[model samples]
Target: GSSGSSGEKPYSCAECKETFSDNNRLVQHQKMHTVKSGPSSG
Candidate 1:
């Protein structure tokens, strides 16, 4: 199914230039902003 469609990384984030497989995944990934990178930050 993934290869049948455009199969292009269109939904990219301008902030990080991160490309996602789908729009849903892209939105989920955006939540990473609130996620702590390490114990020092969390």
Candidate 2:
């Protein structure tokens, strides 16, 4: 089992400042970039 205590978070998001231990997770999290915002008039 992975304790996830590698003490490193090399992947970071430029938009949200979120950090991930794995590049895959970081890539997945970056999907948020495509998230649609509410109506601009709202």
Candidate 3:
């Protein structure tokens, strides 16, 4: 079993201004950049 360490220093998403406990988590969060948004003739 891997014991997860708890320590925070700096890990914020500039794109979304979101704070993540782990650096890896922050990257995966932005994976879904192409969402169903905007208004235009398709």
Candidate 4:
């Protein structure tokens, strides 16, 4: 059984393996990764 208050990440990005907390910042972070390593459309 899951134990401890290990603040599990609930916001994993679709294009990356990075995990995010309660705030909606994963999308913004993912965007940065895309610009740095992926094909930028804009």
After superposition, the stretches of candidate 3 with alpha carbons farther than 4 Å from their true spots are 1-9, 34-42
Over 1-42, each residue of candidate 1 has an lDDT whose tens digit, in order, gives: 443234468787777767777899889878875676755455
Model 4 regions lying over 4 Å from their true place: 1-6, 14-16, 36-42
Model 3 clashing-pair count? 0
Candidate no. 4 TM-score: 0.43
Estimate, for each residue in 1-37, the C-alpha lDDT of model 2 and write its tens digit. 6634445688866777777888998787887568687
lDDT (C-alpha) at residue 6 in model 2: 42
Alpha carbon lDDT of each predicted model: 0.71, 0.71, 0.62, 0.62
List clash counts for every candidate, in order: 0, 0, 0, 0
lDDT of 1: 0.71
TM-score per model over all chains = 0.51, 0.54, 0.44, 0.43
Better of 2 and 3 by lDDT: 2
lDDT by residue (tens digit), candidate 4, 5-41: 4466877655645567754576677667746565657
Q: Which numbered prediction scores highest in TM-score against the true structure?
A: 2
Residue-wise lDDT of candidate 3 within 1-42, one digit each (tens)? Answer: 532333453776667566677778866777644556765568
Error of 4 at 30 (Å): 1.5
RMSD of 2: 6.2
